[PDB]
Design a protein around this ligand. Structure first.
Ligand SMILES: Nc1nc2c(ncn2[C@@H]2O[C@H](COP(=O)(O)OP(=O)(O)O)[C@@H](O)[C@H]2O)c(=O)[nH]1
Length: 360
């Protein structure tokens, strides 16, 4: 039984891959009998387990010449030190130690058995001394290093949570349903590509629904869709259980991203749910879908290609069933059962009898 301290650099107020990774990992560890405490920025808009501690709020920097938009004040520095001093941790696991970040503040404040996970291409570069710049002395305090895609370990999901989620009332729809999940106002999420494919999709599937999960300006999007707006259904930013149900209820999950640096955990969620994936040919997505074995890859920012792919998947039951089968086999390697074991081996490696994380 270990005492583990974890640091998330991002508020839980907004959904994100790093945020969900840290909370779920904490839950998995506690279920195995370990003690976990999570430090993260102020998250007053969501309900959180009692083991989450607020590191305070990053406030805007009020002057020109900064190298960041937001900064944690002196209260945060004090909170971080107190949290470490009182935590008596066997391991400190920090996520995304970008500078400046709450994770880097924790790294500066602490020493002892420290592990870091690098979630993106940008933070993976920090495994190299040349990219650590004048923060080298702090990066040198990291004892174990995990790259999501040092040791490589993929981010985890609870497969059963998706596989066995209840269907939403009224689903599956005879008219078919394409699911989009994300903050659709952000251009990088590629809602614009799916909207440009919509006329061809509706011509072939006259009763099709685009089911949309995530926060954004629904009225602007409807206006963009013009006289096809009636094919759009918005759930808003729903809880995790509803999201899982939505995934299972859709006939296809569409991931039309124009770019990004993440692992692509939403594709894994769809695979777990038993829902066929059509995705942009991004490196991260190609890996999850085993180079097209476990889902359909479409060239990036290609609306005609995206329509063909979505129409193709909905029209060919054999093909769709094949992707789902290969995906359901594949996705077990991302389950927390398997993934958390790999992470614990790193914890074991960096820790040792009578050694604790302490304040620097
Ligand atoms: N419950 C819920 N989860 C969401 C919502 N939007 C995103 N997520 C989850 O947040 C994570 C997003 O991962 P990712 O695609 O990498 O988002 P990113 O971090 O912004 O790149 C996944 O677990 C999503 O299922 C939402 O509206 N509701």
């Amino acid at each position: 039984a270990m005492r583990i301290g974890m640091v998330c650099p991002y508020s839980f107020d907004v959904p994100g891959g790093v945020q969900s990774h840290v909370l779920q990992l904490a839950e998995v560890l506690r279920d195995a009998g370990h003690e976990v405490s999570v430090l993260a920025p102020a998250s007053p808009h969501v309900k959180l387990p009692d083991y989450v501690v607020s590191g305070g709020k990053a406030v805007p920097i009020p002057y020109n010449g900064s190298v960041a938009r937001l900064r944690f004040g002196p209260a945060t520095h004090r909170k971080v030190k107190k949290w470490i001093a009182e935590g008596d941790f066997d391991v400190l696991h920090i996520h995304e130690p970008n500078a400046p970040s709450l994770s880097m503040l924790a790294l500066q404040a602490a020493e002892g058995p420290i592990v870091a996970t690098f979630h993106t291409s940008t933070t993976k570069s920090l495994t190299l001394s040349v990219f650590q710049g004048i923060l080298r002395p702090y990066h040198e305090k990291i004892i174990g290093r995990i790259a999501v895609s040092a040791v490589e370990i993929p981010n985890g999901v609870d497969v059963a949570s998706f596989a066995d989620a209840p269907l939403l009332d009224g689903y599956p729809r005879e008219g078919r349903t394409v699911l989009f999940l994300g903050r659709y106002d952000e251009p990088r999420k590629g809602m614009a590509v799916l909207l440009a494919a919509l006329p061809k999709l509706v011509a072939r599937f006259p009763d099709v629904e685009i089911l949309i999960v995530g926060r954004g300006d629904e009225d602007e999007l409807r206006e963009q869709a013009g006289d096809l707006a009636g094919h759009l259904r918005f759930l808003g930013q729903v809880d995790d259980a509803t999201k899982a149900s939505a995934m299972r209820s859709a006939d296809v999950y569409c991931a039309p991203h124009l770019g990004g640096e993440s692992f692509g955990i939403v594709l894994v969620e769809a695979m777990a749910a038993g829902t066929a994936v059509v995705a942009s040919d991004l490196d991260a997505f190609r890996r999850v879908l085993a180079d097209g074995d476990a889902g359909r890859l479409v060239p990036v920012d290609d609306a005609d290609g995206m329509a063909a792919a979505l129409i193709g998947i909905l029209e060919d039951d054999q093909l769709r069933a094949g992707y789902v089968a290969r995906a359901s086999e594949r996705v077990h390697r991302y389950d927390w059962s398997v993934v958390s074991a790999q992470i614990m081996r790193v914890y074991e490696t960096v820790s040792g009898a009578g050694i604790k994380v302490q304040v620097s």
